[PDB]
Design a protein around this nucleic acid. Structure first.
Ligand SMILES: CN1CN([C@@H]2O[C@H](COP(=O)(O)OP(=O)(O)OP(=O)(O)O)[C@@H](O)[C@H]2O)c2nc(N)[nH]c(=O)c21
Ligand SMILES: Nc1ccn([C@@H]2O[C@H](COP(=O)(O)OP(=O)(O)OP(=O)(O)O)[C@@H](O)[C@H]2O)c(=O)n1
Ligand SMILES: [Mg+2]
Lengths: 734, 159, 60, 48, 186
RNA sequence: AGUAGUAACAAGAGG
RNA sequence: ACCUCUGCUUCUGCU
């Protein structure tokens, strides 16, 4: 009697004039309101109210039908239900003894569908049961707040694709007009439809769980290590304020996460290696010791098809064949001939927006292949010189065109952005310029297409054309856009020198380490370098805190060495990571400044300052170079934002707190070491004490050169202070 | 120190301190100056070209798409048909029902904006009829009564 | 980053007296009209409704 | 979504559900007729 | 127009059943209807019926809402009625419905029709009835002086202030302004 | 009385 | 007297 009982119920209701009035005068639309009509209020103090009600005999509201399904009194004479109707419904008031009764003695259903419906939940336990624990380590680490994924096993659908799918799976006949384009949608539907046939769990719970499962959800969390969802899921277990619990969840990685981590590892290794005396030797060492989730980096590099500049430098070193390309918009980009160079510049979008953006300037040629489409591209500086394109469908040729127009960096696409497009997230975090544009013009190219123009095509027919419509067109096309139809995938043997320059067998320069992106990303999966060349605690913030913590804890030895044998101190290997945080162009001068200042402190007895030494020491670690520049600070690149470390006194980055007697680096204690004359702030000058108008007006720093041995001044030294300086009668060579 | 007027529709005494005399001490002041506010908002427009336009565009789309039942999402709501607070959904239903009995029903479209139209149009009514429970009695609000209730915020203390 | 090394920097941990009592519906009306400049008049007038009603509000 | 009454939607749905159930064999031909009958009686009763 | 279109549709399938055998019948008074009437269902309800049919038959779903479905032919029906001609009209409808299996069937008031590929899935008897009724309508449309009238046949969002609210608006301004429109201009 | 604390509880409502 | 009902329901807001 499928349909029998419900139509009979309906009959009875329509026999009541009131109910008939409601059902004949309430639109489906208006049902959305009257569905919520109530005198009942959302409890405002549920904790108190439950403590109150749980003292009562009949605090629970149950379906009327409970009266048919369980006894009125149990074996012990407890009343389980009553006939009192709960306010505003036909539910009845029952005892908590009714719940226990049901659970010991009620009807037994089969639970076969439970694992599948609540898979998202059960998978959590599966990962944990098959998880492996390593040691706990104790240290301070900066946990930086970022947005991370929180639900492993999603299918990367938008809420409207999920809805569409869930409508098909759970309520197919109520779908309405339109149906599913995507094939992802279709194979999920079938799988789920097949998994959940004959399912008797409430469709509400099935839809709820499907929605939780299928849609990617994120959250902003403080997170020090691996950002993958399977690690996020156990953040409470693996990360504490002063500890890491090494752990590997059961199950496979995502190929996406591994690829992403491989790139981060390879970039980290390249950047660390470039600052060693023998980059190639250092890079090979790190390649050979590093693992990603206990998989050797060497094996990943042999088996993994990722084409990226740092990855390829590592592959070359290891004698692995490379496809001299990178990824962009899902398409693989082999550079045939020419080259260019990375330069940042300001750029007004048609959105009406200023934006620093790395722009490649120069002549280049690109073979481009995807899984459905391919093309030949010729490029200048923000110049789409020409794009010859092919594939399976019109669709797939289009989708690559969009990508290439955007890839050009042309003004016409720059100034075709319309509506909401920003380059910083809500949290003020800078986003990828190019990926933003790509996602935009894939949502809607109509402006882009109309803003581009057209071109009259010749009779060398075979060189076809595509119109601002998206239309196939014989005599006209867009600008630089044509249509046509061995060894693009083919991996080549290269050679690599001591400084990581990669060349073919013919000996042409394919890759230089300066072409490796400077972006410090966060790895989706754990990286263990297992290397003497890398701090045990990963990450840029940790380079800072680790280095200073290490100086301090070893200060007694390092001090004696500062006094007796500086040059050996400066060249120590523990300072190399820190060097990677300093802008390349500043390393030598920063070093020269620091060594000079340190020599001055030696020459001018009685002016020892251990904090000043600790603070500047890592900047000593580069072949020096003397100059005229006085520095008021040194720049450090942390996560692509410059922090400035003030030469004189405390800064946000580095400060000594008198009250705690600790040095605080990026907000973290790194422990403590435990006259007015300052010898190690200015090159060639001494600070005596507070300013004195006796010796004339307050000079900037960059106006002190025009003094002479013994001659004094007043200086705006920094952070609002004015001080009395003296140019030294003898200076220090270093 | 602002300007008093009597409202033509409600008879309410209404104080207007805007463009009033400038503050003369540090006591809390409501003497906000229109031209200064406008300068600030213009400044915000200039710092963020296209921001106002985009936020407006999104708001327009929202106005077109929003269903009347969006208003069910509030908590305790002043219910003018009863002169008592009610859950938001119950308050919405009551307004809709009394509106339709008095001839306002653009909201039958299911669109919030049509309910908003009904609201403004309801103020033209000579006498809005509601029913009180003594059994059941029809009560006619004066145009002024009704408008006062429409413009009411109920008050209670924060616990 | 935008500061020079020679600048002092101070932070006010800040709160306002009786924020809500000193906000003004007439000012909100101005803000709404200015934000929505150049937009269709139906939408400007629709959004101006809330400030106007607040200017004319009463408290039970 | 809809401007149709709650009752009209339920009637339309019962009828067309009963028909598919019939073809697919989830329901007898007797049951089916009673459903369409109940529907007709509801249709009528809705006129006072 | 809509009234007539509807009547035609109801006629097309009234007193048209299928036996437990599965054969076209026609009866005045065990059986089951032959067609499903889709025209005149509210849009949302209609799509549900379509979907239920397409999910049963595993057939593709049409881009547009048809007027009927036939449980014997397993065909969705589109219907039109025209005070114009049967062929200038048909060719517009087949174009609009290009590339989806939908049996069209025009009728004019003259009382002449034109199925697709002149293959009729309805008997002449039942088709005559409709042609009859169409003429009789033309006949009572012409006697009343309507038939000439009949045969010949986005706006921007509005939101404005009625009088009371306009007066409130005028009183909601900084003190120097006389009315809302003057303030908005400033 | 006591709780409390700018206003309440120290049973309310109905028969 | 006694009877009946009630224990957040004339009072818990906003992004
Ligand atoms: C327009 N582009 C972009 N591009 C390459 O595109 C690749 C990926 O694009 P991207 O936006 O720079 O991303 P990337 O910096 O790798 O991302 P991340 O933020 O993770 O560092 C890079 O390796 C970059 O070299 C180019 N490479 C060359 N040679 N010439 C070009 O004109 C361009
Ligand atoms: N529970 C709360 C608390 C605050 N606010 C809003 O937050 C503003 C600032 O709150 P607060 O600083 O606590 O109060 P003020 O109204 O500024 O008064 P004062 O600081 O002088 O006490 C309030 O005016 C009000 O708009 C609110 O709506 N609900
Ligand atoms: Mg405040």
């Amino acid at each position: 009697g499928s349909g029998m009982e419900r139509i009979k119920e309906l009959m009875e209701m329509v026999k009541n004039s009131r109910m008939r009035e409601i059902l004949t005068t309430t639109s489906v639309d208006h049902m959305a309101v009257i569905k919520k009509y109530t005198s009942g209020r959302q409890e405002k103090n549920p904790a108190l109210r439950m403590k109150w009600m749980m003292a009562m005999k009949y605090p629970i509201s149950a379906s009327s039908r409970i009266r048919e399904m369980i006894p009125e009194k149990d074996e012990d004479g407890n009343t389980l239900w009553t006939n009192t109707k709960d306010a505003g419904s036909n539910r009845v008031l029952v005892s908590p003894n009714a719940v226990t009764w049901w659970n010991r003695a009620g009807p037994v259903s089969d639970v076969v569908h439970y694992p599948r419906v609540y898979k998202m939940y059960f998978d959590r336990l599966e990962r944990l049961t098959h998880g492996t624990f390593g040691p706990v380590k104790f240290y301070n680490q900066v946990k930086v707040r970022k947005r991370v994924d929180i639900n492993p096993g999603h299918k990367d659908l938008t809420s409207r694709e999920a809805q569409e799918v869930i409508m098909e799976v759970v309520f197919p006949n109520e779908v309405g007009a339109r149906t599913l384009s995507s094939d992802a949608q279709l194979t999920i539907t079938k799988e789920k439809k097949e998994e959940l046939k004959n399912c008797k769990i409430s469709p509400i719970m099935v839809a709820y769980m499907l929605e939780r499962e299928l849609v990617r959800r994120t959250r902003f969390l403080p997170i020090a290590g691996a950002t993958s969802s399977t690690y996020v899921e156990v953040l409470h277990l693996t990360q504490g304020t002063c500890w890491e619990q090494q752990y590997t969840p059961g199950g496979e990685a995502e190929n996406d996460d591994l690829d992403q981590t491989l790139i981060i590892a390879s970039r980290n290794i390249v950047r660390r290696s470039i600052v060693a005396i023998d980059p190639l030797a250092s890079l090979l060492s790190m390649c050979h010791t590093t693992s990603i989730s206990s998989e050797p980096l060497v094996e990943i590099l042999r088996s993994n098809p990722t084409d990226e500049q740092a990855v390829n430098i590592c592959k070359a070193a290891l004698g692995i064949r490379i496809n001299n390309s990178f990824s962009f918009g899902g398409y693989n980009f082999k550079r045939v001939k020419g080259s260019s160079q990375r330069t940042e510049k300001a750029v007004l979008t048609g959105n009406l927006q200023t934006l620093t953006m790395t722009i490649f300037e120069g002549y280049e040629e690109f073979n481009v292949s995807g899984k459905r489409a391919s093309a030949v591209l010729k490029k200048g500086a923000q110049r789409l010189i020409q794009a010859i394109i092919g594939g399976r469908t019109l669709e797939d040729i289009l989708n690559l065109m969009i990508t290439l127009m955007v890839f050009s960096q042309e003004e016409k696409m720059l100034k075709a952005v319309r509506g909401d497009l920003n380059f910083v997230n809500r949290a003020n975090q800078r986003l990828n310029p190019m990926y933003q544009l790509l996602r935009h013009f894939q949502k809607d190219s109509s402006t882009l297409l109309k803003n581009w123009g057209t071109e009259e095509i010749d009779p060398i027919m075979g060189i076809a054309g595509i119109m601002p419509d998206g239309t196939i067109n014989k005599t006209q096309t867009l600008m630089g856009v044509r249509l046509s139809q061995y060894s693009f995938n083919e991996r080549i043997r290269v050679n690599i020198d001591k400084y990581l320059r990669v060349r073919n067998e013919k000996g042409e320069l394919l890759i230089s380490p300066e072409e490796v992106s400077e972006a410090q990303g966060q790895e989706k999966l754990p990286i263990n370098y297992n290397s003497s060349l890398m701090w045990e605690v990963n990450g840029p913030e940790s380079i800072l805190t680790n280095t200073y913590h290490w100086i301090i804890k070893n200060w007694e030895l390092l001090k004696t060495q500062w006094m007796t044998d500086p040059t050996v101190l400066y060249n120590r290997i523990e300072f190399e990571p820190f060097q990677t945080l300093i802008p390349k162009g500043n390393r030598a001068i920063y070093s020269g400044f620091t060594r000079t200042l340190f020599q001055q402190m030696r020459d001018v007895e009685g002016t020892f300052d251990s904090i000043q030494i600790i603070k500047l020491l890592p900047f000593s670690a580069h072949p020096p170079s003397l100059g005229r520049t006085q520095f008021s600070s040194f720049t450090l690149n942390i996560r692509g934002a410059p922090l400035r470390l003030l030469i004189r006194g405390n800064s946000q980055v580095f400060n000594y707190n008198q009250m705690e007697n600790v040095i605080i680096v990026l907000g973290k204690s790194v422990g403590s070491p435990e006259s007015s004359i300052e010898s190690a702030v200015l090159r060639g000058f001494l600070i005596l004490g507070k300013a004195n108008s006796k010796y004339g007006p307050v000079l900037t720093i960059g106006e002190l050169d025009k003094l002479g041995r013994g001659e004094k001044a007043n200086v705006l030294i920094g952070q609002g202070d004015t001080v009395l300086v003296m140019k030294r009668k003898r200076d220090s060579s270093i | 120190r602002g300007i008093w007027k009597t409202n033509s529709e409600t008879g309410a005494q209404q104080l207007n301190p805007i463009d009033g005399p400038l503050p003369e001490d540090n006591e809390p002041s409501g003497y906000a100056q229109t031209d200064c506010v406008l300068e600030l908002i213009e400044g915000l427009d200039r710092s963020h070209p296209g921001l106002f336009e985009t936020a407006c565009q999104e708001t327009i789309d929202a106005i077109q798409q929003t269903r009347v039942d969006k208003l069910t999402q509030g908590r305790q709501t002043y219910d003018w048909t009863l002169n008592r607070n009610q859950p938001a959904a119950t308050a919405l239903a009551n307004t809709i029902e009394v509106f339709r009995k008095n001839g306002y029903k653009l909201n039958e479209s299911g669109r919030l904006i049509d309910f908003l139209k009904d609201v403004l149009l309801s103020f033209e009514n000579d006498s809005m009829e509601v029913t009180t429970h003594f059994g059941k009695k029809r009560v006619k609000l004066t145009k002024k009564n009704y408008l006062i209730r429409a413009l009411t915020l109920n008050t209670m203390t924060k616990d | 980053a935008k500061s020079t090394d020679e600048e002092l920097s101070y932070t006010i941990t800040g709160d306002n007296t009786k924020w809500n009592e000193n906000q003004n519906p007439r000012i909100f009306l101005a803000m709404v009209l200015r934000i929505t400049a150049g937009q269709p008049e139906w939408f400007r007038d629709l959004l101006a409704v809330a400030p106007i009603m607040f200017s004319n509000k009463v408290a039970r | 979504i809809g401007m149709a009454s709650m009752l009209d939607a339920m009637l339309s749905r019962a009828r067309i559900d009963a028909r598919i159930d019939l073809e697919s064999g989830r329901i007898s031909s007797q049951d089916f007729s009673e459903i369409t009958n109940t529907c007709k009686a509801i249709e009528a009763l809705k006129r006072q | 127009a809509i009234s007539t279109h509807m009547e035609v549709c109801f006629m097309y399938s009234d007193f048209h059943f299928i036996d437990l055998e599965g054969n076209t019948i026609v009866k005045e008074n065990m059986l089951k209807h032959r067609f499903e009437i889709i025209e005149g269902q509210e849009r949302n309800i209609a799509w549900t019926i379509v979907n239920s049919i397409c999910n049963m038959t595993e057939n593709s779903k049409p881009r547009f809402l048809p007027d009927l479905y036939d449980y014997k032919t397993n065909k969705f029906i589109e219907i039109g009625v025209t005070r114009r001609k049967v062929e200038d009209y048909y060719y517009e409808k087949a174009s609009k419905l290009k590339g989806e299996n939908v049996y069209i069937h025009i009728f004019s008031f003259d009382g002449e029709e034109m199925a697709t590929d002149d293959e009729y899935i309805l008997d002449e008897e039942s088709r005559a009835r409709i042609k009859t009724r169409l003429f009789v309508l033309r006949q009572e449309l012409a006697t009343a002086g309507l038939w000439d009238s009949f045969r010949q046949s986005t706006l921007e969002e509005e939101f404005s202030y009625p009088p009371t609210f306009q007066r409130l608006a005028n009183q909601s301004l900084p003190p120097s302004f006389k009315d809302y429109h003057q303030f908005k201009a400033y």
